[PDB]
Every structure is written in C-alpha cells, then in structure tokens.
Amino acid sequence: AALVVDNGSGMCKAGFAGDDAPRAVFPSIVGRPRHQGVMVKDSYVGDEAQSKRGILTLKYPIEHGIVTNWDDMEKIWHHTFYNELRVAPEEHPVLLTEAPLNPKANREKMTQIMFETFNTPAMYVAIQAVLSLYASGRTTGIVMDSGDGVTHTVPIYEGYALPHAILRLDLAGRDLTDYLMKILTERGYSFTTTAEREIVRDIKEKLCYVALDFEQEMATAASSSSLEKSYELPDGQVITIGNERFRCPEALFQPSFLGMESAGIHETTFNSIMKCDVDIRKDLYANTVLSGGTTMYPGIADRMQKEITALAPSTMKIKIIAPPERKYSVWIGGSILASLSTFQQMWISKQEYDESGPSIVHRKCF
Amino acid sequence: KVVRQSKFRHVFGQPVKNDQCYEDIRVSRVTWDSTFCAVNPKFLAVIVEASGGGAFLVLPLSKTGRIDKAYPTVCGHTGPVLDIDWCPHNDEVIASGSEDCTVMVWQIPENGLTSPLTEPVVVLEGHTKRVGIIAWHPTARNVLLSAGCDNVVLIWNVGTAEELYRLDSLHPDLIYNVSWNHNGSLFCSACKDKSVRIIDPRRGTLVAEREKAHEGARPMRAIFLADGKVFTTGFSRMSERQLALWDPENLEEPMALQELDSSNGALLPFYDPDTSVVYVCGKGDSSIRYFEITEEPPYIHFLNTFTSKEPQRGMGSMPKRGLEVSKCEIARFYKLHERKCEPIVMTVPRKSDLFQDDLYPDTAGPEAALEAEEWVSGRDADPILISLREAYV
Amino acid sequence: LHERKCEPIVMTVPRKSDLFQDDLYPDTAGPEAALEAEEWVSGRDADPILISLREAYV
Numbered sequence: 001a002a003l004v005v006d007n008g009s010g011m012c013k014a015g016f017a018g019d020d021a022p023r024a025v026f027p028s029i030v031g032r033p034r035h036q037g038v039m040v041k042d043s044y045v046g047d048e049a050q051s052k053r054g055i056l057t058l059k060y061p062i063e064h065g066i067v068t069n070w071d072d073m074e075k076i077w078h079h080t081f082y083n084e085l086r087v088a089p090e091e092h093p094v095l096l097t098e099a100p101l102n103p104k105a106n107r108e109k110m111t112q113i114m115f116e117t118f119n120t121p122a123m124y125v126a127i128q129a130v131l132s133l134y135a136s137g138r139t140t141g142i143v144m145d146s147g148d149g150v151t152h153t154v155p156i157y158e159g160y161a162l163p164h165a166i167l168r169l170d171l172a173g174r175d176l177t178d179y180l181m182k183i184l185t186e187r188g189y190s191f192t193t194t195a196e197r198e199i200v201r202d203i204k205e206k207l208c209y210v211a212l213d214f215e216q217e218m219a220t221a222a223s224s225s226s227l228e229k230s231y232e233l234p235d236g237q238v239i240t241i242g243n244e245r246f247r248c249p250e251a252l253f254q255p256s257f258l259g260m261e262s263a264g265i266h267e268t269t270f271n272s273i274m275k276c277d278v279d280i281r282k283d284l285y286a287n288t289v290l291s292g293g294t295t296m297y298p299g300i301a302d303r304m305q306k307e308i309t310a311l312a313p314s315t316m317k318i319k320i321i322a323p324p325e326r327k328y329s330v331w332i333g334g335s336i337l338a339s340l341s342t343f344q345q346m347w348i349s350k351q352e353y354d355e356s357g358p359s360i361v362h363r364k365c366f
Numbered sequence: 367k368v369v370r371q372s373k374f375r376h377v378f379g380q381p382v383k384n385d386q387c388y389e390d391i392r393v394s395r396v397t398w399d400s401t402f403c404a405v406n407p408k409f410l411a412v413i414v415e416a417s418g419g420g421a422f423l424v425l426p427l428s429k430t431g432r433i434d435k436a437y438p439t440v441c442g443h444t445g446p447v448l449d450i451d452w453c454p455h456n457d458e459v460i461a462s463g464s465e466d467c468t469v470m471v472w473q474i475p476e477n478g479l480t481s482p483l484t485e486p487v488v489v490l491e492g493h494t495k496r497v498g499i500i501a502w503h504p505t506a507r508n509v510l511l512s513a514g515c516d517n518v519v520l521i522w523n524v525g526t527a528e529e530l531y532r533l534d535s536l537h538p539d540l541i542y543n544v545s546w547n548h549n550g551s552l553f554c555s556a557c558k559d560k561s562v563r564i565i566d567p568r569r570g571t572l573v574a575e576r577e578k579a580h581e582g583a584r585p586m587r588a589i590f591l592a593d594g595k596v597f598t599t600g601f602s603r604m605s606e607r608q609l610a611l612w613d614p615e616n617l618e619e620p621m622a623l624q625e626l627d628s629s630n631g632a633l634l635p636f637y638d639p640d641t642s643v644v645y646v647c648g649k650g651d652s653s654i655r656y657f658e659i660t661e662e663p664p665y666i667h668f669l670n671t672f673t674s675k676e677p678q679r680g681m682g683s684m685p686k687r688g689l690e691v692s693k694c695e696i697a698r699f700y701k702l703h704e705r706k707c708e709p710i711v712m713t714v715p716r717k718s719d720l721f722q723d724d725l726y727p728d729t730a731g732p733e734a735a736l737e738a739e740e741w742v743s744g745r746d747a748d749p750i751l752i753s754l755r756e757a758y759v
Numbered sequence: 760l761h762e763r764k765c766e767p768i769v770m771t772v773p774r775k776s777d778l779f780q781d782d783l784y785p786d787t788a789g790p791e792a793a794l795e796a797e798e799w800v801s802g803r804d805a806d807p808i809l810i811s812l813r814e815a816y817v
C-alpha cells in the first residue's frame with residue numbers, strides 16, 4: 001500500500017497508489033490565533049484552519065514553490081498522515097513529487113524529514129511534470145504546470161527531458177488571487193485580511209474564465225449586463241462582478257497587468273519549445289498538455305491554442321491537451337507510476353539512506 | 367490552603383525589544399532535534415547553515431541588531447554541525463559535534479571573532495557515526511561526554527585529548543539525549559527503544575532501567591533533577607505528548623503522568639535547579655510551558671505559559687550567572703526563528719525593588735569542584751556555589 | 760578499452776562512514792597457491808588461500 005503525496009504551494013493532495021483520485025485534498029495553510037481566548041490548540045492545519053479562519057492568521061508554508069518555513073511544512077505532512085490518511089507513515093512506502101529544476105538542498109530536506117521524522121520504510125521522489133505526462137498516457141510532449149506557486153514549462157521527448165529548455169514563470173494562482181483582490185476594490189468591495197483571501201480565491205475558482213478575445217470582451221462588458229455574476233459572502237452579503245471575471249485570468253497572457261516584465265504563458269510555452277532541437281518541435285506543438293489547478297479557467301485551452309498558433313508557423317498543427325482531471329494529473333500519474341511492476345526498483349530503503357546518505361537520492365532521480 | 371503554595375505561579379514572559387534581538391542569521395536546517403543554541407554569560411553560539419561543511423556562529427552578547435552576512439564563523443567541521451555546548455568552567459571554551467563523526471573544541475577570543483575560525487584546540491575522533499549529543503561534566507574539570515549515532519557513549523579529557531571511558535554495549539537503538547546528575551556521578555539517557563537508562567560511567571554499569579516509559583514511537587527526552595529524580599517527556603500510543611516523573615529507587619510506575627496535547631515535535635525540557643522549575647519547549651511550537659516540581663502531589667504543577675505567534679527552530683537558556691538579578695529575572699530564553707534570535711525574559715513579578723533572597727539561592731559557580739584525574743579515581747563533589755547578591759545594582 | 764584509449768572505470772558503494780567496511784570486504788583469495796601441480800594430478804582438492812584486505816586500509 002504505497003502512499004502518493006502531492007504537496008503543492010497552496011493545495012496538498014494525498015492518497016493510496018492504484019486509486020483514481022486523491023483521498024485527501026486539503027489546503028496547505030497553517031493558522032494561528034490572533035486574539036486572546038476568554039472561555040476556559042495553538043495552531044490549525046488544513047480544513048480545520050479553514051473552518052476556523054475567522055480568528056486565525058492564515059500563512060502558506062510554501063511561497064513561490066519555496067519552503068519559507070519547514071516547521072509548518074512538517075505539520076502539513078503530519079496532518080496528512082495522521083489526520084487525513086489516518087495511517088502510520090512507517091508502514092507504507094511514500095511517493096513524493098518535486099517541482100522541475102528542484103534544488104538539491106530542497107530535495108535533501110524533503111528526503112531527510114521523510115526517513116527521520118516519520119521513519120518511512122521506503123520512499124521515492126519524482127518530477128511533477130513527468131507524472132503529468134503519465135496521466136495523459138503520452139511519451140512525448142511539453143507540459144505547462146501552472147499551480148498556486150509558480151508556472152513551469154517542461155518539454156519531454158521520447159522519455160527524455162531537456163533541462164536547458166525548462167522555463168520558469170513566477171506567476172500562478174496566488175498572484176491571480178491577489179490581482180482579483182486589488183481589482184475588486186474599484187467595485188467597492190474591500191478584502192484585506194488573510195481570511196478574506198480564501199474567499200476571493202473561491203470567487204476566482206467559481207466565476208473567473210478566460211476570454212478568447214480580451215478586447216471584444218471588454219466592449220461586451222461595457223455595453224451589456226449579460227456578463228454579470230453574483231457571489232454570496234459567508235456573512236450572507238452578495239456581491240456582483242462584471243469584467244473582473246475575465247480580467248483576472250488575463251494576467252496569465254499579459255503579465256504587465258501585474259507590472260511584470262516577463263511574457264505570458266502562451267509565449268513562455270513558445271520560447272521553451274523554441275529552445276529545444278528543431279527535429280522535436282513538431283511533436284511538442286501537437287502535444288501541449290495543461291496541468292495544474294490554475295488551468296481550470298473555462299476557455300483557457302481555446303485562448304491557449306489561438307495564441308500559440310499565431311506564434312507557431314502556419315504549417316504547424318497545434319493541439320492543446322486539457323484533460324478534465326488535470327488538477328490532479330500530478331497525483332494521478334504518481335499513483336499510476338507507483339502501481340507499475342517495474343517501479344519497485346526505484347524505491348530507496350531507510351537502511352540504505354542511513355548508511356549512504358542523500359547521495360543515493362540525487363542519483364536515480366532527475 | 368485554597369492556592370498551592372508557590373513563588374512562581376504568576377511568572378510572565380516578555381520578549382526584549384526589536385533592537386535587542388539578533389537578525390539576519392541563517393539558522394541551520396538540519397532535521398536533528400537539538401537545542402541549536404548554546405549561550406554563556408559572555409557569548410551567544412548558534413548553529414548556522416554553511417554551503418560547505420558545517421559551522422556555528424559565535425557572537426558577543428552586546429552585538430545586537432542586524433548581523434553581517436559575511437560575519438566570521440567557526441567553520442572547522444567538514445560536515446553539518448549537530449549540537450554545541452559551552453564549557454561551564456570556561457566561558458571561552460565550547461565543544462561541537464557534527465556529522466563528520468568528530469568532536470572539536472574551540473577557544474574563542476575575548477573580543478569575539480575577527481577572522482573565521484577553522485583550527486580547533488582539540489579534536490576528538492572516537493565515534494564511527496555522526497555525534498549529536500555532547501554534555502560537559504557539571505563538576506569534573508575538562509570532562510566531556512559524547513554520544514554519536516553509533517549507540518556509543520564516550521568520556522573525553524579535553525585537557526589531555528584522552529578518551530576516559532567507553533560505553534558501547536548499553537544502548538540497543540539510537541540515543542535521544544543524555545543528562546548528568548547533580549554531582550556528575552551518574553547520567554541518564556533516552557533511547558529509541560522507549561527505555562530510560564541510568565548508567566554509572568566510571569563503572570560502566572546500568573544502575574536503573576525503565577522499559578516502555580512512553581508508549582509512543584516519537585522521540586522522547588529524559589533529564590536528571592537536582593534532588594535526584596528523572597523528568598521524561600514523551601509520547602503516548604495515541605500520539606499525545608506526556609510529561610512523566612520517575613523515582614530511580616522505584617520505576618515500576620511514574621510518580622506523575624500528565625498529557626499536554628496531541629501536537630507533534632519533540633519536547634525539549636529546560637531545568638532550573640535553583641527554582642525547581644522545568645520549562646518545556648517543543649520544536650516548531652510557538653509557546654513555552656513551565657512547570658514546578660515539588661514533593662506535594664501530583665509532584666508536577668502547571669504554572670503558566672508564554673504564548674507567541676511564531677514557531678521556534680531551537681532554544682537556548684541563559685544560566686543564572688548572566689541573568690539580571692535586579693529586575694527579578696529568573697530565566698532568559700533565546701528563541702530562534704528561521705532568520706532571527708529573539709531573547710525572552712522570564713520575570714517574577716515583585717513589588718519590592720530590593721534583592722530577593724528567596725528567588726536567588728546560591729548557584730553553581732564557574733569553577734570546577736574536581737579535576738578529571740581526581741574524578742577518575744572515584745571522587746565525588748557537589749558544584750561550588752556562589753552568591754548572586756553581588757550582581758545586584 | 761576504446762579503439763585508441765584505455766579508460767579505467769570505478770565501481771564504489773556509497774557509504775557515509777570513512778572507516779574500513781568489514782562487510783564490504785570479506786576474505787579474498789590471495790596470490791599464494793594452495794597446492795602444487797604434482798599434488799593436483801594425484802587428486803588433491805583445496806580451496807584458495809584467503810587473505811585480509813584490512814591492512815590495505817589507509
């Protein structure tokens with residue numbers, strides 16, 4: 001019974017190998033009380049923190065795909081094994097996921113905690129981008145992984161990755177949530193505290209969408225009310241948003257909205273494929289696979305295809321692969337890979353690490 | 367009769383001002399659960415992260431405020447440093463154990479470090495694995511206890527660089543922590559097998575052993591008390607952190623057993639023999655809990671708790687000699703964040719501004735009672751006590 | 760062996776400890792013959808003489 005744990009910047013997905021969906025999906029947040037109790041637990045992790053977020057100060061242990069504080073990070077893992085999965089970590093091998101171009105120091109800390117703090121029998125860590133292609137059942141393609149912390153573009157050809165062509169874009173869902181926060185002020189709605197941030201994130205996940213033509217959508221919203229949508233706040237208040245539904249996701253293609261000099265995802269995909277060899281660009285053009293929760297905006301694939309087609313040569317066949325379950329593509333691929341018979345030799349034993357150290361972890365891993 | 371008689375039931379914690387802290391310190395990121403800090407009334411030592419090998423930063427107490435990133439450090443180990451300990455009889459001497467399976471003892475200059483320190487005074491190579499436990503002898507001079515991951519306990523004479531005693535066939539699993547007794551004659555050890563062992567080093571015999579002291583599999587600690595009892599902090603089968611009191615003459619059942627919470631993180635206890643107060647801090651916890659140990663049942667009385675909004679990475683305790691006696695301060699705690707060390711003042715509220723004799727009984731001085739050769743013979747002497755009245759201003 | 764170059768390759772076991780590894784290096788057959796050719800014709804059978812690699816540790 002191998003455990004597949006996919007820890008992201010904002011979301012954490014966990015479950016058992018062979019399953020078709022993660023069993024535990026809870027926010028990766030740690031909350032602490034900001035007031036003094038008057039009726040006679042100093043921290044809350046996951047859904048309980050979300051349920052009590054009114055009196056708590058929510059903090060993300062991972063920021064931009066970087067562990068800003070490992071002490072809360074261990075709490076997330078401890079909450080996963082004992083409070084979410086309700087299993088003993090020492091009895092199940094654990095499959096881990098790493099961001100592309102993960103620092104060796106980051107992997108070492110992840111490895112050391114797993115074998116020492118939790119005393120896992122065996123464990124392995126795999127690239128999130130590679131696992132996403134496993135779920136799609138493809139051996140060649142370029143996957144853009146846009147989650148909560150950072151967006152990555154990793155091209156893979158015939159099972160070979162190209163690290164030199166891997167591009168990083170410091171722009172993800174959390175930045176959108178902040179962008180939705182700032183643009184909601186012009187409509188008269190004020191959200192400042194960390195508790196309000198989750199509320200704004202819920203609105204983003206429910207009412208935001210990607211417009212095929214941003215300029216035409218702006219004209220439509222300025223001359224009609226058909227794009228208005230209403231959201232009910234937890235206190236029973238209702239708010240209405242218009243152009244902000246498609247303005248917030250537009251930062252994906254126009255980072256200058258956030259003041260970022262970097263280019264959009266559509267171009268960032270184009271530079272990445274432009275960086276690899278000429279003979280493999282054909283397969284990557286027709287094998288663009290979308291992964292991450294930030295890719296659930298409706299119509300993002302259609303806008304994706306139109307943008308790259310303008311950049312790509314006219315003779316070139318552009319195919320954007322957006323499976324409906326790509327939010328858990330990293331976890332789904334991990335469960336598939338862990339269920340393979342030929343994966344048993346990639347496992348790293350606790351005794352082996354105790355005598356060899358993290359050197360064996362840098363090897364056998366990419 | 368209504369209120370249990372005590373002098374510390376209202377002791378409150380107060381962090382020092384921002385300018386009195388130490389920032390811009392890259393604290394070590396080693397999963398080993400140690401104090402990560404050693405402080406003496408002259409210097410502050412903190413284990414830091416180095417790209418190559420291991421190092422710990424030693425700075426004068428007066429050097430507050432932001433710390434230069436290029437500040438010289440004690441970088442002599444070829445591997446990451448696991449733990450550090452100041453010499454009680456020499457404030458300028460600190461021992462360090464690292465992952466390079468060696469122990470090196472350093473002599474800090476009076477004014478601090480002007481250049482990075484690489485060569486140590488004495489190197490101790492007796493462990494086949496990483497050494498994460500070091501403990502100076504409370505009374506005997508130039509005597510150091512080292513316990514590596516090889517389940518081997520060694521006694522060293524730093525003055526002569528000689529391994530005084532070797533204790534190997536005594537710990538079947540990894541050892542958590544080791545603490546000397548009051549006179550230095552005995553030491554207690556916590557092992558991964560949930561067994562607490564009291565061992566005579568000069569004789570190499572197991573005095574007392576309690577199996578399955580805590581049923582949880584999480585790491586657990588054990589310390590000696592001044593009166594001669596053992597305080598163990600451990601976990602239950604339901605992964606609940608517990609505090610236990612043990613009598614070395616009767617270990618069939620603990621004297622007390624209280625459960626604190628179900629949170630993770632090992633509980634590092636800090637004992638104050640003068641006040642008989644143990645401060646319990648947990649790794650990654652934002653609160654410090656202090657309890658009073660008395661002969662009255664249930665022998666463990668919860669006093670109060672200082673609560674913060676930030677988890678700490680390690681903990682260092684200021685001995686009595688460096689405390690501000692005039693402000694009715696009984697303990698100072700250097701809370702270590704991921705990039706900052708925040709001293710915390712433990713203060714007894716008192717109306718009178720004069721010296722409080724009851725709060726400040728005679729404390730062990732910085733002079734060793736015996737020597738290594740005398741202690742080897744079997745001599746036993748209590749630590750020499752000094753008076754804190756002179757520190758009053 | 761390449762077409763014009765002789766390249767040694769080194770297989771090593773990753774071990775944290777820098778001391779001698781008893782398990783990695785059991786007794787090995789030495790360069791001393793156990794029996795002579797004439798004894799072999801008779802039918803004598805003997806195992807190779809085993810030596811210790813501990814002395815090679817530096």
Ligand SMILES: Nc1ncnc2c1ncn2[C@@H]1O[C@H](COP(=O)(O)OP(=O)(O)O)[C@@H](O)[C@H]1O
Pocket residue numbers: 007008009010011012146147148149173174177201204205206291292293294295296297327328
């Ligand atoms: N239906 C949705 N529409 C838009 N964005 C979403 C949706 N669901 C999730 N997200 C965004 O995806 C981000 C996290 O996605 P994911 O990659 O699955 O986890 P992580 O990034 O933590 O690994 C969140 O910040 C959230 O804002």
Ligand SMILES: [Mg+2]
Pocket residue numbers: 007008009147148292330
């Ligand atoms: Mg992700």
